[PDB]
Scaffold this active site. Structure first.
Site, PDB file in Angstrom:
ATOM      1  N   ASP A  18      10.982 -11.328  -3.196  1.00  5.13           N
ATOM      2  CA  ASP A  18       9.720 -10.600  -3.117  1.00  5.13           C
ATOM      3  C   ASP A  18       9.253 -10.454  -1.663  1.00  5.13           C
ATOM      4  OD1 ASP A  18      10.138 -12.119  -5.573  1.00  5.13           O
ATOM      5  OD2 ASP A  18       7.994 -12.037  -6.004  1.00  5.13           O
ATOM      6  N   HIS A  46       6.033  -8.240  -1.243  1.00  6.40           N
ATOM      7  CA  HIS A  46       4.592  -8.167  -1.482  1.00  6.40           C
ATOM      8  C   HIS A  46       3.748  -7.596  -0.353  1.00  6.40           C
ATOM      9  CE1 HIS A  46       4.363  -9.380  -5.586  1.00  6.40           C
ATOM     10  NE2 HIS A  46       5.084 -10.465  -5.371  1.00  6.40           N
ATOM     11  N   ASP A  49       9.335  -6.550  -6.395  1.00  9.90           N
ATOM     12  CA  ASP A  49       8.038  -7.025  -5.921  1.00  9.90           C
ATOM     13  C   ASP A  49       7.827  -6.705  -4.441  1.00  9.90           C
ATOM     14  OD1 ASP A  49       7.551  -7.798  -8.503  1.00  9.90           O
ATOM     15  OD2 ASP A  49       7.058  -9.909  -8.050  1.00  9.90           O
ATOM     16  N   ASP A  86       1.852  -4.786  -4.061  1.00 10.74           N
ATOM     17  CA  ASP A  86       0.784  -5.640  -4.597  1.00 10.74           C
ATOM     18  C   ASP A  86       0.636  -6.930  -3.788  1.00 10.74           C
ATOM     19  OD1 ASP A  86      -0.054  -3.875  -6.618  1.00 10.74           O
ATOM     20  OD2 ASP A  86       1.218  -4.820  -8.156  1.00 10.74           O
ATOM     21  N   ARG A  87      -0.570  -7.480  -3.876  1.00  9.46           N
ATOM     22  CA  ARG A  87      -0.952  -8.736  -3.236  1.00  9.46           C
ATOM     23  C   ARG A  87      -1.173  -8.548  -1.727  1.00  9.46           C
ATOM     24  NH1 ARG A  87      -2.331 -12.436  -7.428  1.00  9.46           N
ATOM     25  NH2 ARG A  87      -0.745 -12.304  -9.086  1.00  9.46           N
ATOM     26  N   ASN A 130       8.536  -7.021 -11.443  1.00 10.46           N
ATOM     27  CA  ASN A 130       7.480  -6.844 -12.438  1.00 10.46           C
ATOM     28  C   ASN A 130       6.264  -6.128 -11.844  1.00 10.46           C
ATOM     29  OD1 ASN A 130       7.135  -9.528 -11.185  1.00 10.46           O
ATOM     30  ND2 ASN A 130       5.389  -9.822 -12.543  1.00 10.46           N
ATOM     31  N   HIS A 131       6.130  -6.157 -10.521  1.00  5.29           N
ATOM     32  CA  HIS A 131       5.017  -5.470  -9.876  1.00  5.29           C
ATOM     33  C   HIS A 131       5.269  -3.978  -9.627  1.00  5.29           C
ATOM     34  CE1 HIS A 131       1.743  -8.356  -8.998  1.00  5.29           C
ATOM     35  NE2 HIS A 131       2.709  -9.248  -9.149  1.00  5.29           N
ATOM     36  N   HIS A 160      15.296  -9.386 -10.781  1.00  2.00           N
ATOM     37  CA  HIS A 160      14.057  -9.929 -10.256  1.00  2.00           C
ATOM     38  C   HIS A 160      13.623 -11.221 -10.950  1.00  2.00           C
ATOM     39  CE1 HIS A 160      10.225 -10.196  -8.285  1.00  2.00           C
ATOM     40  NE2 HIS A 160       9.659 -10.367  -9.460  1.00  2.00           N
ATOM     41  N   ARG A 200       3.405 -17.154 -18.600  1.00  5.87           N
ATOM     42  CA  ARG A 200       2.913 -15.883 -18.081  1.00  5.87           C
ATOM     43  C   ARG A 200       2.405 -14.954 -19.182  1.00  5.87           C
ATOM     44  NH1 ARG A 200       5.302 -14.697 -12.726  1.00  5.87           N
ATOM     45  NH2 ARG A 200       7.106 -16.089 -12.247  1.00  5.87           N
ATOM     46  N   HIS A 256      10.823 -13.878  -7.865  1.00  2.00           N
ATOM     47  CA  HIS A 256       9.752 -13.913  -8.905  1.00  2.00           C
ATOM     48  C   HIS A 256       8.912 -15.184  -8.928  1.00  2.00           C
ATOM     49  CE1 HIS A 256       7.882 -12.500 -12.685  1.00  2.00           C
ATOM     50  NE2 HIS A 256       8.540 -13.362 -13.453  1.00  2.00           N
TER      51      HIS A 256
HETATM   52  O1  LIG Z   1       6.742 -12.473  -8.850  1.00  2.84           O
HETATM   53  C1  LIG Z   1       5.774 -13.103  -9.355  1.00  2.84           C
HETATM   54  O2  LIG Z   1       5.418 -12.858 -10.533  1.00  2.84           O
HETATM   55  C2  LIG Z   1       5.052 -14.192  -8.575  1.00  2.84           C
HETATM   56  C3  LIG Z   1       3.739 -13.687  -7.972  1.00  2.84           C
HETATM   57  C4  LIG Z   1       3.429 -12.251  -8.322  1.00  2.84           C
HETATM   58  O3  LIG Z   1       4.268 -11.380  -8.012  1.00  2.84           O
HETATM   59  O4  LIG Z   1       2.338 -11.930  -8.887  1.00  2.84           O
HETATM   60  C5  LIG Z   1       4.009 -13.836  -6.473  1.00  2.84           C
HETATM   61  C6  LIG Z   1       3.911 -15.316  -6.073  1.00  2.84           C
HETATM   62  C7  LIG Z   1       5.193 -15.856  -6.706  1.00  2.84           C
HETATM   63  C8  LIG Z   1       5.827 -14.609  -7.329  1.00  2.84           C
HETATM   64  O5  LIG Z   1       5.411 -13.605  -6.416  1.00  2.84           O
HETATM   65 MN   LIG Z   2       6.183 -11.504  -6.921  1.00  2.00          MN
HETATM   66 MN   LIG Z   3       7.705 -11.053  -9.942  1.00  2.00          MN
END
Ligand SMILES: O=C(O)[C@@H]1[C@H](C(=O)O)[C@H]2CC[C@@H]1O2
Ligand SMILES: [Mn+2]
Ligand SMILES: [Mn+2]
EC number: 3.1.3.16
Length: 315
Positions: free
Chosen positions: A67, A69, A96, A99-100, A128-129, A177, A225, A252
């Site tokens: 990821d 992010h 990923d 986001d964030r 997933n994002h 992922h 989750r 992830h």
């Molecule tokens: O990928 C994820 O679901 C987790 C969080 C997210 O994507 O929301 C973020 C922190 C750890 C991983 O990356």
């Molecule tokens: Mn993530």
């Molecule tokens: Mn993820």
């Protein structure tokens, strides 16, 4: 407008270098250029199999990142530490991307530009994002609306639907992922056959690929989750055996050291967002694989300075 412009409507290495500097300096790619990248990359991605199959010759290597992010200044640091992408320096970014973090637009357009420039050597897998319900909540939709328009966001969403879900190197290492599956008996061909151009369902193989996590104990558990499952080492061993694989690489989950190797070697996590959300304090890592030796080699790195924009400023 005096920013980066495509050359004859296409991405070039000079454009990418100009784009990275433009973004470092907190400037915006013209909307017509962004649009061109998005429509071109949609076409490239829509021709790919849901399972990307890549052969590494004996003298070749590849770098696997987890990821990112929207941590654009950390993405630049990866390229400084490890070299720019090229035909001799291939990359896989394992979902990923957005986001964030609050430079998601910069990360994703940089990644898309390199996918266009080196389509056989720069690989992007869905996380997933890279989905609409997550982007609505966790920053990316807000960021795109702030920088461009709702219409540009709809186009991103359509492009994300074509991202492949897994990648297999030399018939030996599978990369996705999230993880493995909520049911036994899933094969590489089942993955190939997933019709992926959609928002993920809330159950089944496409959901698991983006959402599952490993657990240390044997068996499967309902995921904390709210979707997919946790899978134990018995699950991993059975999957690898049926599919004649050596191990999996997934992302992830944040890991303090940037990586983890679970299930006795069989399930590797790589996470490439250091000091996640400016708070977690974690190291990050990327992995090197080589055609003559597919065992993972880990390279750790730490966060670098970025402009004063808070995480989730757009969420
Ligand atoms: O990928 C994820 O679901 C987790 C969080 C997210 O994507 O929301 C973020 C922190 C750890 C991983 O990356
Ligand atoms: Mn993530
Ligand atoms: Mn993820």
């Amino acid at each position: 407008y005096s920013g980066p412009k495509l050359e004859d409507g296409k991405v070039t290495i000079s454009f990418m270098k100009e784009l990275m500097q433009w973004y470092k300096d907190q400037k915006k790619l013209h909307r017509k250029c962004a649009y061109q990248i998005l429509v071109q990359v949609k076409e490239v991605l829509s021709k790919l199999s849901t399972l990307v199959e890549t052969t590494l010759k004996e003298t070749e290597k590849i770098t696997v990142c987890g990821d990112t992010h929207g941590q654009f200044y950390d993405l630049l640091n990866i390229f400084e530490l490890n070299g720019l992408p090229s035909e001799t320096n291939p990359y896989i970014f394992n979902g990923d991307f957005v986001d964030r973090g609050s430079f998601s637009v910069e990360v994703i357009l940089t990644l898309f530009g390199f996918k266009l420039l080196y389509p056989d050597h720069f690989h992007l897998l869905r996380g997933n994002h890279e989905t609409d319900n997550m982007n609505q909540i966790y920053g990316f939709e807000g960021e795109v609306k702030a920088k461009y328009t709702a219409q540009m966001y709809e186009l991103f969403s359509e492009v994300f639907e074509w991202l492949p879900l897994a990648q297999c190197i030399n018939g030996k290492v599978l990369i996705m992922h999230g993880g493995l599956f909520s049911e036994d008996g899933v094969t590489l061909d089942d993955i190939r056959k997933i019709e992926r151009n959609r928002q993920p369902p809330d159950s089944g193989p496409m959901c698991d690929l983006l959402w599952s996590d490993p657990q240390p104990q044997n068996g499967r558990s309902i995921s904390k989750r709210g979707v997919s499952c946790q899978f134990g080492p018995d699950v991993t061993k059975a999957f690898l055996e049926e599919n004649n694989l050596d191990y999996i690489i997934r992302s992830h989950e944040v890991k303090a050291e940037g990586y983890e190797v679970a299930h006795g070697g069989r399930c590797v996590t790589v996470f490439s967002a250091p000091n996640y959300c400016d708070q977690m304090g974690n190291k990050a890592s990327y992995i090197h694989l080589q055609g003559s030796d597919l065992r993972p080699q880990f390279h750790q790195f730490t966060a670098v300075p970025h402009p004063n924009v808070k995480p989730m400023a757009y969420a």
